[PDB]
Design a protein around this ligand. Sequence first.
Ligand code: GTP
Ligand code: GDP
Ligand code: MG
Lengths: 50, 430, 439, 186, 50, 95, 244
Amino acid sequence: MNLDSIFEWILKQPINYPGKHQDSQPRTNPAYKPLEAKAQFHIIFKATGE
Amino acid sequence: MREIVHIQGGQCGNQIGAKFWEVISDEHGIDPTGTYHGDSDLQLERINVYYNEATGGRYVPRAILMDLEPGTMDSVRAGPFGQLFRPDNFVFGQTGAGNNWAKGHYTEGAELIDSVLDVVRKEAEGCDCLQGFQITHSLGGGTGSGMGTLLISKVREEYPDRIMETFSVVPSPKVSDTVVEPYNATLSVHQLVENADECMVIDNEALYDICFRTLKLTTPTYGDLNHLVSAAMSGVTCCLRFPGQLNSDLRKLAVNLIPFPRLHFFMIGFAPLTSRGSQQYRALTVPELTQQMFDAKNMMCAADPRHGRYLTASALFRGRMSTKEVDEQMLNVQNKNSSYFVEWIPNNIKSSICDIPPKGLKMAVTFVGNSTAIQEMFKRVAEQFTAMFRRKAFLHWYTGEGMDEMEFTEAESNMNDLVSEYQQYQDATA
Amino acid sequence: MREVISIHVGQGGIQVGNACWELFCLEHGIQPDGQMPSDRTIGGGDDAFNTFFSETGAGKHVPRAVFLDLEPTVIDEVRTGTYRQLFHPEQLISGKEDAANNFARGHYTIGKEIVDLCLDRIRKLADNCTGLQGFLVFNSVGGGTGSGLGSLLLERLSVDYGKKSKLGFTIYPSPQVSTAVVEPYNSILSTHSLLEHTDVAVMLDNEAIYDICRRNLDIERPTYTNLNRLIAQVISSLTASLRFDGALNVDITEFQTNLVPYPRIHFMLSSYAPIISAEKAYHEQLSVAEITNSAFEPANMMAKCDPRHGKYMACSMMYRGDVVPKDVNASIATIKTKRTIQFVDWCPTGFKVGINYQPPTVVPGGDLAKVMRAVCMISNSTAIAEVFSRLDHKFDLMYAKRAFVHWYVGEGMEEGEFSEAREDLAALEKDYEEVGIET
Amino acid sequence: MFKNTFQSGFLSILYSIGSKPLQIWDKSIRNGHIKRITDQDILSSVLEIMGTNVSTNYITAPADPKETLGIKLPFLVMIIKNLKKYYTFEVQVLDDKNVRRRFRASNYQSTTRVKPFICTMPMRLDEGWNQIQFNLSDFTRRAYATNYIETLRVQIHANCRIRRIYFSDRLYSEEELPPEFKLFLP
Amino acid sequence: AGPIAASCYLGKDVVSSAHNAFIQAVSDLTTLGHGLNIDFGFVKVYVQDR
Amino acid sequence: GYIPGLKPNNHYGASYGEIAKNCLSNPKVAQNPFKLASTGFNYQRHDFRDPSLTATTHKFGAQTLLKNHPSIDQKSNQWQSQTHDSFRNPLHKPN
Amino acid sequence: QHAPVFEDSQAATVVNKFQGLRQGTGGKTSTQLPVKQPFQAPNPICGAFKKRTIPVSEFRRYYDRGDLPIKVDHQGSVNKIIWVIQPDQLDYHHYLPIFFDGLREKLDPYRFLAILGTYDLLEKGSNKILPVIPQLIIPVKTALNTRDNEIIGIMLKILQRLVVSGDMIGEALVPYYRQILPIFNLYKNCNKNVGDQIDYGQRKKLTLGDLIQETLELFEQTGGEDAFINIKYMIPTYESCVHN
Ligand SMILES: Nc1nc2c(ncn2[C@@H]2O[C@H](COP(=O)(O)OP(=O)(O)OP(=O)(O)O)[C@@H](O)[C@H]2O)c(=O)[nH]1
Ligand SMILES: Nc1nc2c(ncn2[C@@H]2O[C@H](COP(=O)(O)OP(=O)(O)O)[C@@H](O)[C@H]2O)c(=O)[nH]1
Ligand SMILES: [Mg+2]
């Protein structure tokens, strides 16, 4: 697992890890479109690293 | 009727046995002088299972005390309830094993084993109809782990259809008192899995964890660990010694717990265990007993039960209680934890009820469960063993009296074989 | 002139025999010492106990019963009880070692050493009788000793006596409530053994009795004693037609003529009504119509089966008390007019009614109250196929992986013995559906 | 379903050489496996049924229940390879009276008994390939003393190798047997 | 997780729930093997079998 | 609402009304063994020490449990359940 | 390597209305409010069918040794090994365990030389192969533990040839069933339910389930009387073959 296969592992089993991360959320600014469930969940981590 | 004979070996085995016999004596109302001062008539109906009647009306345990050094038995005789034992059953050498499995199995054990076989043959032949043997020993020492396994091999060869039951103290890596623990542990497991009909593993680390967390007592000593082990082991044969709603002797447990012959390693647990100051506040009921019993920390082993799937489990209830409640609780826990129970063995919980509770309890439960989590304990033992054996360290002591590295190699391979065949049934599906 | 012998094998059989014999002694007025009191005679007439007891000539009476076991604990409990002087001391046959839930052990290893004494005592009991009616056998089916010893006993008495009636009252394991892990195996083996050897079988699953105790008797933690007491009440209601006068008498021999359409089909389930506690027993009429309505309620079945899932084939009525034939006929007409219960097409009438005058006897220390009218539900229906089908799948899951088979193989039983039992189960299941289809 | 249809000397229900040997047959498997492979003993393709739990793994002649597979032919015969393990088969028969009978032949059974619906019978298998001629004439005449009019179903259980099922109508020998029905000796 | 959501233009609650699911990587670690290399930037965390 | 004794020491297989009667008509559930007031002055009167201890260290440290356990009364279920007539008449009710 | 830009991948139907701080479950304690579903541990699967990480083989070193008489001859269509010195002169006690160790190897020509070397060794050997049996137990358990289809598939063919090559070999192998049987149990039912259509894989015996069944078949006839009970003890599924 390269920190990305983990994403599929979590997304594979919604029952084991239920939450709002399983589906896409609207953004707080109307300028930005809502992201994919996988895409929005990487962009959080890049923020955490920074 | 259906009596059994006790054999204990090594310092650890004798320490276990002394407390076990003291507990049984208080359970049956036998004073340290051997005189019956009991209060209930049921305390003597089935005394012949463990005790022999002598002229003059005293009772003596049929325990054979075996050791390779006279130091520890002089201590166990001088202790309380040490006068119960027949002095003719004491057997000993004058040299000692020196924590060397080879020396306690080939050189010194062989020449001394004749006397112990003679005395145990006399003890087994005297009784009307034998039920089985029980052995208490530790796998971390030389004289015990070696001579006891040789004795079990001999007794199994002479008695093919009897039940052999043993209690094992396995050396955990976190708390280790001997530098050579993996060697004799693996060597003894090799013979134990082949010979013993039933085996139970006790870890010292789990005992210390239980004493520190549940009992919450500041300074545990070896007395408390022995007390817990003795209570747990007496809870197995409580139902054989006493009546109950569902009587179930040792043979009945084995049939329902061993699906395949090579899988006979179990972990045990006792409930309830409470601190001294918190006993005024708890309400003892069956659901409380079950939820404390199925707890991971309650188990007597370092193996963690949720890391594997329970093949079969057995619960023994002491005291009087309703049958419907026990069945409903068993079904409830089985349905709530369906992930940890294998799916090709439906209704894999066994329950038995004995109407006489232990001294000091209104209810008590003993738990025996066969789980696939013990594969971690075997894996960790082998890793240390191969780590020491790759560089041939501490090997000349064992090879100085007629052993060769091929025996060590086959012993290691057999242990890995057990791990593979034991984890095979974890992932099998319908 | 009429006599029957009860054979209790296994721990469950012994524990239910205790309750039923206590009930019989209280019903016939015999003290636990076996001596009828000189004063305070509760029952008129003579030789009513002759069906169940035997007169020693001067003094006490001895039940026509024999207890069998391989483990001595319950036998010693009985022998040191309050009924020590009741039974003949040498008819409480106790073994030495327990079979430990192993049907092969109870059929090939240690049951043979005792079966000779069993048959000797059975003969010494039977030769006393002259107008013997039949044998009653009680056995928990999920236990090795009970299953194996019952199989051997039925096999031996099939050839020793032949055509004589035998009644088996099994206690099948619940669909989801169980105590052991291997009860499907020996249960199937015992069913194979007794399919061709008994005349009538009764289903007595424990889960249904638990449900009955919880809903009606208002008991939240019932134990085995209550179940045994209700089973004893059912047996007493069944046997009351032999030792008591009534408007319409029913004999044991008149069961295969009314309840067994084909030799293969003799398994059937029971029920009993009313079952009410004394705290609310006196607030309702307990009329015959309402008791027979409660009898036909699918939730009151003594076994965990749903009669609504199949057609009714035969149904036998036994009423004891002050019932009237016209009221019984009205109740039968109402039940026939009801639509939820459907019968097979080739059986126009499927009701046989028996009427007795003696009200049921209450037991001190029990749970039931005193009632005039009671009805025993004995019916044969195609709906009992589900209990066979479910245990069939319970068996296959373990049998595919050779689970727990070595313990039975090592006791002299061949590996292939399971397959023909499975074939007999499959053929029995196909028979039930074959009969159930219309023409 | 083979009713109102002509048949004189032979009529096959299953035959392992074809595009799809079994249309009408229905397969039910729990722990077994079904495949068609060539045989080393006879250089030809043979169907395979194997697996544990002999009772659960089987194949039925009709695809669905609730209909008749009617055939009037009195003599039955099969081609089976002896695997020295468990194997059994059943046949559904109709007698003069409008009631049905079951006939069973079991490899592992050693006792026989007659019942109104089932008449089990032990059977013995020699080594290698062999053919079994199921009379079905005296079997219904001896077990129930009733003539035979109609046979409904035939069922084959697990752990056996099958080459051809057909009805001979009478005792036949090899020379009059046509070559495709003959099993050519390797 | 406040400033992280502010930079990502997402709700505060979803980022916290997104963290919680990822923290359940111990279940992936508990099972045998399943090597990990959690980089997300400057520091790289390598996890062998155990 | 709360029949007092039925929860802690569970009552056995019997009718709810009968066991409720048994656990209500029994002694205790009242009376002042220590003569304590609920207002909170006899707290300073009383001592609050249990006389069921001993000592420890250097040998064994578990201690026997509190008196909340049965003794002598150990007796099987068949002894309780099955007696012949020596009970109260279920239907006496003197008139 | 390629990876799509994560800040661009977007969804459409999800509505961009934002609740914000205007929220709260306080004062609205209805019985239909949603609850949490807590995290639960997944089903353990262990490593029963995982790869074994094949250990190093001594054959590769011993080929680099230049002390095994064997040469790859390409004169034929398929490469055929030629014996510089005839195998009858060689000491089977020393060389035969080494060639069995080469069964693990996969890289050319170490894999190629192993199987061809073994087949000639067993075929030409007449009576001196029997004493080497105790030393062959270590390699066979190691290779079978690799849990890989190709290595297991080929070496079960090796095992069949070993028993049939000479007499009395099956009898001496009976005590050693406990070290090799457990792998056979795992793949005993590893067969494919193809159904009706032709299985064209008969040409290459790559079906594990069929290979194990026939390998156990040869064990019983040659092993002797005691052979059957040893197999049934090791694997519970097995059924008698020689017995009627
Ligand atoms: N209805 C009822 N069933 C009981 C009772 N006691 C035991 N059983 C049933 O008996 C089954 C097991 O049999 P056992 O009670 O052990 O007695 P057994 O049949 O002779 O078997 P063994 O223990 O080998 O002697 C359990 O699964 C219970 O369902 C009882 O008191 N009442
Ligand atoms: N439970 C318990 N374990 C003990 C006791 N004394 C020693 N041990 C364990 O036994 C191990 C040493 O075993 P040893 O005495 O050498 O065995 P022996 O050679 O047969 O006497 C140590 O790892 C301890 O953990 C005791 O009193 N109680
Ligand atoms: Mg029993």
